[PDB]
């Protein structure tokens, strides 16, 4: 994959759960970068999908 970073927060639509809580600051292991939507990463703990708008990728 590779780690990008949170960068605004992005609470889960109630009711989705496969849809990622992003916190600033979380780091995402981005584990699919689809280029037709979300992304597919895992924020400490869970899969899930999320923003690509939300995320910053770091090296640095």
């Known amino acids: 994959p590779?780690?990008?970073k949170a960068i605004q927060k992005r609470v889960p639509?109630?009711?989705d759960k496969t849809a990622l809580?992003?916190?600033v600051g979380d780091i995402?292991?981005?584990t699919r970068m689809n280029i037709n939507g979300q992304?597919?990463?895992e924020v400490n703990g869970r899969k899930?999908?999320?923003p690509f708008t939300h995320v910053?990728?770091?090296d640095p």
Do not use: D, M, P, S
């Open 21 to 23: 809580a992003l916190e």
């Open 39 to 41: 992304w597919e990463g």
């Open 48 to 50: 899930g999908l999320f």
């Open 13 to 15: 639509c109630a009711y």
């Open 2 to 4: 590779v780690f990008a």
């Open 56 to 58: 910053k990728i770091f």
């Open 28 to 30: 995402v292991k981005v």
